[PDB]
């Protein structure tokens, strides 16, 4: 079915322009039955509409952002994009792709049919500090995990055994350390029967720093 895919930086400096892109698949954007657009969610806040673009070249915007934002569309690429000028700390948010379905026939009847995944974007003067990842080893039922430490900003993904390991897995939300950097950890509950028999590898990613690591956790 129709799907949206997020793309863009997780970090922009104050006063710069934030530029994000959606890729559309499972259908074409070249249709009068759809409008395409952007929504954001500052951490701890609700959703805010940014704007929308029509494949023929028209557009509409949230007045609070209209003076700063531009949304474009390209029907040969089957993509759409958002450019937000003069960014500040206020703009730290999770940005989402969305499609808008034109309901009925010839009326202003709309709903947001397909949503993106969310792209976390931080506005800051600081560098793209990547994480270091360390194993947490155990020594009935056992548990094991990975410690993800010292990074900024915080768009990170953690998975186990490349997605093979699901049940028993939990991750924790980012922790802000007094250092100004983030800490995060991930654990999995395993039987003592599999411990030391079955291997457990965490796969950790941080987009802005281009860091991709893999760590195997073994018992003592």
């Amino acid at each position: 079915q129709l799907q949206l895919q997020e793309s863009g930086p997780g970090l922009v400096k104050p006063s710069e322009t934030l530029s994000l892109t959606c890729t559309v698949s499972g259908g074409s954007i070249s249709s009068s039955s759809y409008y395409w657009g952007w929504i954001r969610q500052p951490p701890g806040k609700g959703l805010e509409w940014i704007g929308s673009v029509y494949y023929s070249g028209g557009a509409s915007y949230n007045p609070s952002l209209k003076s700063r934002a531009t949304i474009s569309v390209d029907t040969s690429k089957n993509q759409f994009s958002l450019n937000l000028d003069s960014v500040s700390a206020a703009d730290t948010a999770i940005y989402y792709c969305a499609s808008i379905a034109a309901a009925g026939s010839f009326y202003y009847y709309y709903y947001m049919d397909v949503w993106g995944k969310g792209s976390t974007v931080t506005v800051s003067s600081a560098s793209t500090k990547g994480p270091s990842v360390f194993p947490l080893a155990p020594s009935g039922t056992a548990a094991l995990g990975c410690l993800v430490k010292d990074y900024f900003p915080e768009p990170v993904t953690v998975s186990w055994n490349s997605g093979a390991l699901t049940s028993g897995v939990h991750t924790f939300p980012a922790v802000l350390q007094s250092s100004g950097l983030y800490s995060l950890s991930s654990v999995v509950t395993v039987p003592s029967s599999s411990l030391g028999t079955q291997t457990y590898i965490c796969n950790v990613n941080h987009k802005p720093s281009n860091t991709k690591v893999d760590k195997k956790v073994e018992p003592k």
């Binding site: 509409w49 709903y111 020594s139 548990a143 410690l147 509950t189």
Partner: protein, 210 residues
């Protein structure tokens, strides 16, 4: 200028729950509802005040008119832990309400407790992080006390709690004790003491360097 009420609520599995929404103006166009799973993008469930998206479970329903609209889950499932949002299209703009958080109350459950040493790879950095894990318990509230050679710690530990589990409706808790390598090495016995409602007595996990 939309608003929702309550800002949040808790209910048990199988309970019928209702949240409300007030439009910024009398609705002349569509009004819809979205579900935001913990950490995920919002997803449409209801459109034109009451129509379901294909694939949406029959337990979801919307209603109302004018400025006053509602959202109901006929029998709440643990998979329904989410924030629900009211949305309208008016004056050529899209507007969302604050959102209402819905989650699960359930009976007490005792935590499973584990303690982990820092890796050699971390000790090579000059720092040491000792980690205590509480897994699958209810209520969220828990007390963790770090001890090193029976010295109670403070001023050097962080804590973090998971989202409510989508199936079990339980929580897990991590606590990380941060020592310099020198502080880790000057001591022998490491321990994590846990106090929780589901326990008949506080419990302790521990390790020794060697």
């Amino acid at each position: 200028q939309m608003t929702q009420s309550p800002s949040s609520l808790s209910a048990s599995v199988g309970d019928r729950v209702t949240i409300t929404c007030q439009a910024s103006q009398v609705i002349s166009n569509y009004l819809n509802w979205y579900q935001q799973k913990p950490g995920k993008a919002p997803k449409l469930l209801i459109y034109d005040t009451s129509n379901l998206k294909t694939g949406v479970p029959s337990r979801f329903s919307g209603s109302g008119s004018g400025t006053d609209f509602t959202f109901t889950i006929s029998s709440l499932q643990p998979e329904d832990i989410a924030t629900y949002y009211c949305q309208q299209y008016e004056n050529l703009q899209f507007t969302f309400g604050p959102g209402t958080k819905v989650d699960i109350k359930r009976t007490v459950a005792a935590p499973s407790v584990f303690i982990f040493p820092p890796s050699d790879e971390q000790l090579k950095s000059g720092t040491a992080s000792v980690v205590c894990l509480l897994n699958n318990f209810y209520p969220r509230e828990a007390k963790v006390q770090w001890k090193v050679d029976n010295a109670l710690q403070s001023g050097n530990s962080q804590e973090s709690v998971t989202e409510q589990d989508s199936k079990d409706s339980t929580y897990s808790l991590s606590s990380t004790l941060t020592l310099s390598k020198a502080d880790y090495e000057k001591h022998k016995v490491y321990a994590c003491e846990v106090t929780h409602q589901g326990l008949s007595s506080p419990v302790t996990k521990s390790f020794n360097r060697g």
